[PDB]
């Protein structure tokens, strides 16, 4: 006897379990973007399908329909805001066929690589997990963050961390103390 908590699942497995085309295609996304799972890939296919479903049904509606206008621009604006939808594509038809890995490009793990500082996608992921990232002034350790194309310029190293200052580090302290303690 209490208000239930709404909860939904965010992925869906493919119909065919074993085919060379999909298995080789997914592994391309894993290495190119540093993903630990196929569930990491199935998640976007779930969100992309839901976005595609909404645009598919809104396009069947006649033009200038108040529902199509309100939800169409809201869906375009939200996609444009995170950068997955380019500015010149706002016709509610490019939403349908963007890409599988257009959303995968805005992931903070692969977004760190674009703004240097990792020189590998794997390095970018562990830097995120090891708290050495601050999208704004607040630390994030989630590889999938979907930068809003406005916080992209603010993605710098974590101020309260090594590579940001104020501490030489954990093991570097042991090394530094080793020289100091053995100097005499």
């Amino acid at each position: 006897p209490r208000a239930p908590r709404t909860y939904s699942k965010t992925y869906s497995t493919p119909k065919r379990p074993y085919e060379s085309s999909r298995l080789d295609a997914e592994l391309k996304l894993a290495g190119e973007f540093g993903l630990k799972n196929k569930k990491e890939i199935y998640r976007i296919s779930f969100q992309l399908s839901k976005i595609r479903r909404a645009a598919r049904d809104l396009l069947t509606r006649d033009e200038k329909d108040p529902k199509r206008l309100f939800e169409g621009n809201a869906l375009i604006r939200r996609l444009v805001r995170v950068g997955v939808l380019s500015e010149d594509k706002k016709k509610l038809d490019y939403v349908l066929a963007l890409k599988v890995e257009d959303f995968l490009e805005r992931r903070l793990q692969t977004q760190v690589y674009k703004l240097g500082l990792a020189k590998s996608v794997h390095h970018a992921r562990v830097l995120i997990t090891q708290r050495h990232i601050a999208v704004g002034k607040q630390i994030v350790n989630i590889p999938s963050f979907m930068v809003r194309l406005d916080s992209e310029k603010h993605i710098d190293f974590a101020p309260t961390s090594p590579f940001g200052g104020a501490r030489p580090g954990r093991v570097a302290r042991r090394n530094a103390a080793r020289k100091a303690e053995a100097s005499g």
Partner: protein, 56 residues
């Protein structure tokens, strides 16, 4: 059908097989790192191309 038989041979081949122990090997990266290991070996390296891209 007939229900009788001979239970004296139960597990006959399980016992006769010789015992061979796990060959020790360095442990394999698990998780995201294994995705790198799979990516580079089969999409960058072409070593196992024996006749039909035979990896085994």
């Amino acid at each position: 059908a007939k229900v009788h038989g001979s239970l004296a041979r139960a597990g006959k081949v399980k016992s006769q097989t010789p015992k061979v122990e796990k060959t020790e090997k360095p442990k394999k990266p698990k998780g995201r790192a294994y995705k790198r290991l799979l990516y580079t070996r089969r999409f960058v390296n072409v070593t196992l191309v024996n006749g039909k891209r035979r990896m085994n």
